[PDB]
Amino acid sequence: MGLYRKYIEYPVLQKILIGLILGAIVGLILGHYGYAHAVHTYVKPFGDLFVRLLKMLVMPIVFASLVVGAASISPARLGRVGVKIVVYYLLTSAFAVTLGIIMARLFNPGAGIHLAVGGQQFQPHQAPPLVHILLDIVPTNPFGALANGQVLPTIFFAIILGIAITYLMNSENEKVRKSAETLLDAINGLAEAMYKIVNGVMQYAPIGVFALIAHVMAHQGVHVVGELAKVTAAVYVGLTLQILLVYFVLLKIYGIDPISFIKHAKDAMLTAFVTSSSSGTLPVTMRVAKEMGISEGIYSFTLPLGATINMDGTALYQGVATFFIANALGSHLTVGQQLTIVLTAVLASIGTAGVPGAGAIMLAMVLHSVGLPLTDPNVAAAYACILGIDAILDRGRTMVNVTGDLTGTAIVAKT
Numbered sequence: 001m002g003l004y005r006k007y008i009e010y011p012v013l014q015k016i017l018i019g020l021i022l023g024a025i026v027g028l029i030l031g032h033y034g035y036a037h038a039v040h041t042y043v044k045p046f047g048d049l050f051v052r053l054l055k056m057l058v059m060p061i062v063f064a065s066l067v068v069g070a071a072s073i074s075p076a077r078l079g080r081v082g083v084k085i086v087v088y089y090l091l092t093s094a095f096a097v098t099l100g101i102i103m104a105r106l107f108n109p110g111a112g113i114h115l116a117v118g119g120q121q122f123q124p125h126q127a128p129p130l131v132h133i134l135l136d137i138v139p140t141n142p143f144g145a146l147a148n149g150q151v152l153p154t155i156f157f158a159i160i161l162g163i164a165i166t167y168l169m170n171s172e173n174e175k176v177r178k179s180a181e182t183l184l185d186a187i188n189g190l191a192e193a194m195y196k197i198v199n200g201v202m203q204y205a206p207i208g209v210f211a212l213i214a215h216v217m218a219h220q221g222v223h224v225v226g227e228l229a230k231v232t233a234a235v236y237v238g239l240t241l242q243i244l245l246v247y248f249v250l251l252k253i254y255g256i257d258p259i260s261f262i263k264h265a266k267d268a269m270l271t272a273f274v275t276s277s278s279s280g281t282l283p284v285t286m287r288v289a290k291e292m293g294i295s296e297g298i299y300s301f302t303l304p305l306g307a308t309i310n311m312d313g314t315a316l317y318q319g320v321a322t323f324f325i326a327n328a329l330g331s332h333l334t335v336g337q338q339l340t341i342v343l344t345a346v347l348a349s350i351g352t353a354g355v356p357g358a359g360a361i362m363l364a365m366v367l368h369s370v371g372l373p374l375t376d377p378n379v380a381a382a383y384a385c386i387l388g389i390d391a392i393l394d395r396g397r398t399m400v401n402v403t404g405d406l407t408g409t410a411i412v413a414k415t
């Protein structure tokens, strides 16, 4: 087990990029000499196992995290400035998703791939009338939603359970109060346990990323590499313009000087960029918070709230991916479908945990709203090719999310 210990003790982020570049070389070299059936039958199953691993823990982590999160939060009317706090992030998320559509049309990623994994192109199914969709949010059986795999009914049932369980903790009866604590602790244990499994799966990602990239290179060929570069470059330039478009303009109109703003915050983004974990990068956020030389009481609630609420960078990733998959599958997005992208993506960005890899887990939830379920083999193939390239894209989107946190707290502080 000498080599096993060395392999584990290494930056997980570095290995994925090492695994990604190695996979690309192997696929093209093999593809030039043929052996298309060789990779399809020998190295493909490693990629499929990684896909099944991610889908395993999506359901248990959605239910447990919401119950713990909803119970902890209590309605305090947000005082006076809090209503100004929550409204700020909601509007900004809409802008980020809206910018994704125009930039995606500018480059048009996913053209000329022609997925035929299932033997035929994906055929959209007509959506049921909106009355049936809304009435299905309420689960007729709370246990049925979990077992059958429905996600929307589970979210509704999880939220109300957390709200109902925080009243018992405040109840005067001792037996009722004690029973509420035990039930909350058991679910909190399940949510914590699901996070340790996330680290275990990420250690298998370099092997999983290697298998997925190699399989795609051999079949599609060198052509598919070009589009993968287009989506790679698109997100960064879209994020780059977004920072100047909305984050800079608020600084200019108000009295805070943007040039000095980044000078004190320069260490903040750089530390987050290296670690690529916005939720875990909290200590530096409070570090710069206490050395701004201003009030701390505003910082008592803004940073914990803005940890999960603000996720502009991931939001652009969610929107661009949703559009990219449609082009690969050959199904054009109508105007009506584009309207539900921003509504779904913005609320989706709210539920993101913040740890790296969370966007991949909840990207599929937006796909269900569009009408592209994961059970479709054609959708699975296109979605799998994104899972390989997530690490390099996740390097940039963390910086935007943390920057929006730091920028947003300062402008309200000026008021």
Ligand SMILES: N[C@@H](CC(=O)O)C(=O)O
Residues within 6 Å of the ligand: 276, 277, 278, 279, 313, 314, 352, 354, 355, 356, 357, 358, 359, 360, 394, 397, 398, 399, 401
């Ligand atoms: N780690 C990303 C989120 C993600 O990777 O899904 C962020 O905090 O911006």
Ligand code: NA
Residues within 6 Å of the ligand: 088, 089, 090, 091, 092, 093, 094, 309, 310, 311, 312, 404
């Ligand atoms: Na936002």
Ligand code: NA
Residues within 6 Å of the ligand: 308, 309, 310, 311, 348, 349, 350, 351, 352, 353, 354
């Ligand atoms: Na979030």
Ligand code: NA
Residues within 6 Å of the ligand: 278, 306, 307, 308, 309, 310, 311, 401, 402, 404, 405
């Ligand atoms: Na954030």
